[PDB]
Amino acid sequence: MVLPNFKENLEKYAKLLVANGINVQPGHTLALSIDVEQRELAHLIVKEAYALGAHEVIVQWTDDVINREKFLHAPMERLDNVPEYKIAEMNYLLENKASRLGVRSSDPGALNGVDADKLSASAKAMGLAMKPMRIATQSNKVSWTVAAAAGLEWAKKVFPNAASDEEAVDFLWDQIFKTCRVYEADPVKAWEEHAAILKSKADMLNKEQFSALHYTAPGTDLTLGLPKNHVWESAGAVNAQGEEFLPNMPTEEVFTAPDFRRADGYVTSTKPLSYNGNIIEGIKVTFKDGQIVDITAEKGDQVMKDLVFENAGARALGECALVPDPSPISQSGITFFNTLFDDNASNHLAIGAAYATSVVDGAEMSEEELEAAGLNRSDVHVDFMIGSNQMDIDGIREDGTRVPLFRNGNWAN
Amino acid sequence: MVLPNFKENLEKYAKLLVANGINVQPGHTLALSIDVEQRELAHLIVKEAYALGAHEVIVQWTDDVINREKFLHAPMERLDNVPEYKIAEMNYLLENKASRLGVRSSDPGALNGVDADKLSASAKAMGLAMKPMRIATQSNKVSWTVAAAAGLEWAKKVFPNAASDEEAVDFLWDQIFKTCRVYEADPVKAWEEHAAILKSKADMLNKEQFSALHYTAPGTDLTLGLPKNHVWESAGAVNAQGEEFLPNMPTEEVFTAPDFRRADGYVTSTKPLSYNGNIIEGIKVTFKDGQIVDITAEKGDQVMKDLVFENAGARALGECALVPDPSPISQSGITFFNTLFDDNASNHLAIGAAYATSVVDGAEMSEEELEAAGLNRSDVHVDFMIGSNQMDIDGIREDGTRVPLFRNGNWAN
Ligand SMILES: N[C@@H](Cc1c[nH]c2ccccc12)C(=O)NCC(=O)O
Numbered sequence: 001m002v003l004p005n006f007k008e009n010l011e012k013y014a015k016l017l018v019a020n021g022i023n024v025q026p027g028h029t030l031a032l033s034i035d036v037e038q039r040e041l042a043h044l045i046v047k048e049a050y051a052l053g054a055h056e057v058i059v060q061w062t063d064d065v066i067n068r069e070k071f072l073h074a075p076m077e078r079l080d081n082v083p084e085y086k087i088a089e090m091n092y093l094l095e096n097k098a099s100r101l102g103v104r105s106s107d108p109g110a111l112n113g114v115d116a117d118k119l120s121a122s123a124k125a126m127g128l129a130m131k132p133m134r135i136a137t138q139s140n141k142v143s144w145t146v147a148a149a150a151g152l153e154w155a156k157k158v159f160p161n162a163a164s165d166e167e168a169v170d171f172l173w174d175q176i177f178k179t180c181r182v183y184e185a186d187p188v189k190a191w192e193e194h195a196a197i198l199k200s201k202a203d204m205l206n207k208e209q210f211s212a213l214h215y216t217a218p219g220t221d222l223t224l225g226l227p228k229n230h231v232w233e234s235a236g237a238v239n240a241q242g243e244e245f246l247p248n249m250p251t252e253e254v255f256t257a258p259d260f261r262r263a264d265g266y267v268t269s270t271k272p273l274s275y276n277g278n279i280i281e282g283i284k285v286t287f288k289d290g291q292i293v294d295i296t297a298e299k300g301d302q303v304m305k306d307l308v309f310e311n312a313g314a315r316a317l318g319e320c321a322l323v324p325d326p327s328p329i330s331q332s333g334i335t336f337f338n339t340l341f342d343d344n345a346s347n348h349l350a351i352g353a354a355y356a357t358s359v360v361d362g363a364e365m366s367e368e369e370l371e372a373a374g375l376n377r378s379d380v381h382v383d384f385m386i387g388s389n390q391m392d393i394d395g396i397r398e399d400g401t402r403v404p405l406f407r408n409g410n411w412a413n
Numbered sequence: 414m415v416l417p418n419f420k421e422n423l424e425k426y427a428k429l430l431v432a433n434g435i436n437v438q439p440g441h442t443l444a445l446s447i448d449v450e451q452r453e454l455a456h457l458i459v460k461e462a463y464a465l466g467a468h469e470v471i472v473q474w475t476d477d478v479i480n481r482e483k484f485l486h487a488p489m490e491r492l493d494n495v496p497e498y499k500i501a502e503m504n505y506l507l508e509n510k511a512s513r514l515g516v517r518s519s520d521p522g523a524l525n526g527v528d529a530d531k532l533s534a535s536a537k538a539m540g541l542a543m544k545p546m547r548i549a550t551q552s553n554k555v556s557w558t559v560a561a562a563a564g565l566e567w568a569k570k571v572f573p574n575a576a577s578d579e580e581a582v583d584f585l586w587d588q589i590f591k592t593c594r595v596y597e598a599d600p601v602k603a604w605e606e607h608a609a610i611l612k613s614k615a616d617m618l619n620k621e622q623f624s625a626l627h628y629t630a631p632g633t634d635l636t637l638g639l640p641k642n643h644v645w646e647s648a649g650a651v652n653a654q655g656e657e658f659l660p661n662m663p664t665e666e667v668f669t670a671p672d673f674r675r676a677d678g679y680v681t682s683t684k685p686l687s688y689n690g691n692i693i694e695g696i697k698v699t700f701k702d703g704q705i706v707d708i709t710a711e712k713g714d715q716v717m718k719d720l721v722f723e724n725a726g727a728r729a730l731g732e733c734a735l736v737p738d739p740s741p742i743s744q745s746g747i748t749f750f751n752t753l754f755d756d757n758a759s760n761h762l763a764i765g766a767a768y769a770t771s772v773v774d775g776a777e778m779s780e781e782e783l784e785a786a787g788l789n790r791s792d793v794h795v796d797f798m799i800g801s802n803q804m805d806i807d808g809i810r811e812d813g814t815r816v817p818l819f820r821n822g823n824w825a826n
């Protein structure tokens with residue numbers, strides 16, 4: 001009722017994720033991560049990947065309830081290390097240059113019961129064990145895409161105003177379809193148009209080559225240095241095999257990496273965050289000489305400290321992204337409690353790893369060369385949102401000139 | 414109206430599978446193999462496993478649609494061998510003495526229209542790669558349970574006259590709950606009494622120690638030798654750690670292994686069979702000197718010929734089981750096209766591997782000893798059914814005396 005032609009649009013969505021998000025090509029292997037709740041979408045995705053000439057789809061099924069039981073009941077020794085067979089599966093994917101399509105529909109509070117130390121122990125061990133995959137994906141060795149599906153518990157959280165559980169799921173699918181341009185008579189041209197607009201903006205910032213950025217808002221006075229030869233990117237990426245792909249669907253951001261050594265001041269989150277299956281609220285981060293010197297949260301304080309202080313590289317930033325407050329997802333007024341969606345409603349910063357393509361020729365650099373160039377090396381990448389209808393940002397030029405970039409949450413001069 | 418209190422009964426079923434089927438103990442690792450469509454049951458199973466003290470439940474999610482897509486579209490090279498990481502997951506389970514709970518819900522014709530040579534190559538490669546698990550399980554080194562859940566495509570085939578999909582599914586769950594004693598006030602006691610009654614038939618046969626069995630029915634005249642010192646088993650088993658478990662739920666059979674070197678005559682199958690995701694109908698087999706000399710089917714003839722002639726040990730039998738025609742699954746009038754259920758409606762025979770436990774002290778014999786003892790070795794174990802209300806069976810004593818065993822498909826007396 002609130003959603004037109006669900007089955008047809010679900011198929012159209014699945015084909016878009018495969019053809020334009022991951023861009024499957026004859027001979028590819030595709031790894032799909034998707035919740036068991038979303039078997040209907042998984043079937044559609046798998047069929048199209050094979051129709052586009054994939055040699056193999058490997059589905060990594062995920063399930064919130066079973067994962068919570070494990071975190072609630074398994075002893076630490078089953079939680080604080082990653083079994084070799086999981087690493088072996090990882091290596092099979094990498095040896096086959098598998099594209100990674102991650103469809104997220106998870107409950108934002110999936111792990112609300114769980115002891116903080118177990119959450120921390122499991123995230124650190126995963127960050128360590130999965131490093132080769134993170135490195136490959138972050139330097140675009142293979143295609144990869146993060147997209148969403150309308151999970152029940154998630155939809156319930158997003159739409160308290162819904163008349164039923166079924167209706168809440170439908171409004172969530174309507175957002176996912178709307179923002180991924182599924183309703184457009186030609187979604188592919190619609191994405192081309194969207195990529196082209198965002199690319200105009202990124203190209204302009206790339207001409208500027210600011211020295212640093214200065215963000216001001218009620219929770220926030222933060223200055224970030226920008227690496228020499230940095231690259232602002234947006235909607236499309238290109239993999240090491242020359243193929244175009246979309247890392248995030250939906251997406252509304254242009255972003256680059258700050259120099260992980262230059263950050264000073266303080267910043268306040270402006271959206272709740274789902275991290276380690278807990279909802280984190282009111283994050284305040286303080287930086288001195290590039291490093292987080294203090295992080296607190298009104299809710300989820302320990303979980304955030306554990307992220308920052310237990311994981312390699314997690315005391316510095318790997319991304320600074322700009323999304324105008326008047327853009328569609330933001331203007332919807334909807335809080336998604338979901339990084340993919342909320343990132344695309346608000347300026348965001350990532351704790352941890354820079355994308356290698358954030359510096360000219362980064363895709364070719366050793367890890368040593370990336371760190372030399374100012375791109376944080378880390379075993380995590382955790383975005384949090386700082387944007388609002390009040391935020392100002394200036395770019396600082398090499399002659400000391402402050403150039404307005406955002407005024408009252410929007411591009412301005 | 415067909416199936417009241419479904420949620421209550423589903424949870425009661427989950428509890429039974431975990432507490433009495435697998436018999437989860439503190440410290441155990443449980444491996445649950447289950448279709449994604451059965452996520453509701455999976456949750457309940459996993460919850461109860463941890464409630465009973467499991468340290469870890471690993472779920473191996475299956476999906477017919479996605480498996481069929483791979484078989485239809487992947488090249489032979491991805492089908493005819495097993496990647497290392499799958500072997501590594503199997504080894505993690507072995508190392509952890511994982512109990513194996515397999516809940517089957519597959520569409521009997523899930524793989525219709527797949528190239529026969531692909532089905533054959535995959536089954537062979539998997540049979541070889543997974544042998545350590547099958548060996549451990551065929552010798553009760555861990556608890557294991559095969560049980561069912563009412564998958565939609567399977568229910569539609571079992572109940573082609575159902576008023577609606579929902580009704581077909583309810584009818585199938587009703588059979589699963591009834592036959593697994595879920596409706597009893599005290600299912601455990603009901604199981605205990607059921608096992609008692611079958612164990613008394615098994616003990617009678619173990620006492621007689623027949624040299625051979627002679628089956629007669631329209632289209633059947635078959636004499637099978639029995640191994641010296643064989644063991645007839647039923648309902649309960651005891652695993653290598655002294656824990657009681659139920660290898661099949663439901664179950665109505667008493668069975669042992671024939672001497673694989675002794676078989677003469679011919680036999681007509683009286684139920685269809687689902688093998689490699691294809692429905693096989695009208696199976697007839699002729700044996701001479703212990704070996705299949707001809708096998709034939711009205712539908713699926715090639716799949717059977719490939720089974721028998723492409724796999725080592727597959728020309729000989731590993732199981733001979735008795736189920737009286739008046740027992741409840743037989744009397745229901747339903748053909749399930751599913752091995753667990755149809756096995757428990759009808760006498761059956763297994764092409765391929767004998768269970769090690771079918772000879773005295775077999776669970777500690779090597780492969781060489783088992784084979785010397787007359788128990789067939791094979792990477793396959795495919796049951797087909799041969800019983801009916803017209804079948805007579807004699808037991809044949811060592812001195813040639815013919816003892817009536819079944820008459821008209823029921824115990825003779
Ligand atoms: N800024 C996003 C994702 C991201 C990385 N490379 C990109 C190229 C083009 C668009 C978006 C890209 C981020 O780091 N997080 C979003 C996510 O959840 O992956």
Ligand SMILES: N[C@@H](Cc1c[nH]c2ccccc12)C(=O)NCC(=O)O
Binds near residue numbers: 559646666732734752
């Ligand atoms: N006859 C069953 C397996 C089996 C092994 N030990 C048992 C004890 C009690 C009942 C059944 C037992 C068979 O080979 N096939 C059933 C199956 O699908 O596993």
Ligand SMILES: [Zn+2]
Binds near residue numbers: 255319321343348383
């Ligand atoms: Zn971003």
Ligand SMILES: [Zn+2]
Binds near residue numbers: 319350381382383
């Ligand atoms: Zn990010």
Ligand SMILES: [Zn+2]
Binds near residue numbers: 666668
């Ligand atoms: Zn049997």
Ligand SMILES: [Zn+2]
Binds near residue numbers: 732763794795
């Ligand atoms: Zn059998």
